[PDB]
Symmetry: C3
Subunit: 187 residues, 3 copies
């Protein structure tokens, strides 16, 4: 009864080469190529293309620099005034929810996709994911990595190069690998 896609979204083990998911991934790549060319050449149709790619954006005017990459596109949901700089990658096998006024520097990667640590299970043709949630007014610094299952609170700032393995509270700066609070933001 459950499709592989149902399992995927639920965070359960799913067959990555399921017919439907494969078609979704190849379609995401084709559309993504068109989008990246639109934004590189500065065509206004970049917004229409992006709005077909992303699951949703609050204002339909998400500003994403090239070359953007994502797995499905449709699991990505952004608030108002979303900005991502060059070469961001979002593996949205599970939901990636991003709030308002969020800002990604270049090379930010968000992963929801993951695998079993044990070889037989990892090699079985099945994998899984954990959703990522990012609050309002989050600034993610250059080259940062947001790992699966992570939530980032409102007004948090992720230092460049940070590797985020655990939830980030409201109003802090985190930095390092693994990322740790390096400062509290007052107000």
């Amino acid at each position: 009864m459950k499709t592989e896609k149902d399992k995927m979204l639920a965070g359960e083990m799913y067959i990555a080469d399921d017919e439907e998911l494969v078609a979704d991934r190849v379609e995401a790549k084709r559309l993504t190529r068109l989008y990246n060319e639109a934004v590189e050449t500065g065509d206004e149709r970049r917004f229409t293309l992006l709005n077909q790619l992303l699951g949703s954006s609050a204002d339909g005017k998400a500003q994403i620099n090239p070359d953007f990459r994502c797995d499905y596109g449709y699991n990505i949901h952004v608030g108002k005034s979303f900005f991502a700089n060059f070469n961001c990658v979002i593996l949205d096998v599970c939901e990636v929810r991003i709030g308002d006024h969020c800002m990604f520097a270049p090379g930010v990667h968000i992963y929801t996709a993951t695998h079993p640590l044990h070889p037989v299970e990892r090699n079985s043709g099945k994998e899984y994911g954990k959703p990522v949630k990012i609050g309002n007014n989050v600034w993610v610094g250059g080259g940062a990595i947001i790992n699966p299952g992570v939530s980032i609170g409102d007004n948090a700032v992720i230092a460049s190069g940070a590797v985020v393995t655990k939830d980030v509270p409201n109003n802090v700066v985190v930095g390092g690998n693994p990322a740790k609070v390096i400062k509290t933001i007052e107000e």
Copy 2:
């Protein structure tokens, strides 16, 4: 009386969506795309395109692998025999000065662009930058990040994965996140 571009270059808060700055970024992207195509296909005209993109290079023969990315292009200035490997990104809202014989491994990022720490100000449509300066004979290792306002001395070596958050003296190797001196070069 200062234009938004004037403010940007001086390290002051500027409106990023100023019509002049938007036009410059649109132009840089369009030209960067042609340049990347030229270097990917191995056409000799890659140099003439690159020389229209960068602010200056000492020998007009900078060697930059695809896909290169920059904000403006014109704020980047390189010495002779400049080399950058695959996928380098330079956010040049402020000056990026690079000396002679510098080489970047793949995925090196240089940032001058930055933002206020508090949300209201960060979300106000204004941001700022701090220039980056790199000396002569610098080797920047793969995936290293050079943050805004940093200066790197002559003959410095940045280990791969380094996250450079403060000035680096001459003749050292730095590594880690944040980067720290790990060796003196003699």
Copy 3:
């Protein structure tokens, strides 16, 4: 010696002139073919495998699954086992041999470097550089954005955490993470 070329020295891990014409021509060809390959996989064309099998030195099953935009120096120094998978934007600098076993998977932004340079400026600026080969065992999972440096071997069943920077050999059956990469725990099966 008698007919040893710069390419021979490069492969042997010896100092070699990077701008030797044969090597320059090989890199130019790799970039040109990489561009076609990346378009093929982006557009979902079946011939992506045909092109990839001309780019890589070898793959055990001729069906390596490599996402765009892949980058490499030569292509022909890369050899992968069965069921190889690399996610978006992986870079392999294969001036020396890069040998990868069966069922390996790279997350996005994995970089493997065999190319390196002298630490002292005069020698580094001399137009010569060198490499050290990389070997990766079976069932290795390399996490997003990880760096594998020159001369590194990674054992069977090892997993590399996202963001790890691997400077030394990784033994079989460990999870490593951090910069520099250190053992997090062991894995058995």
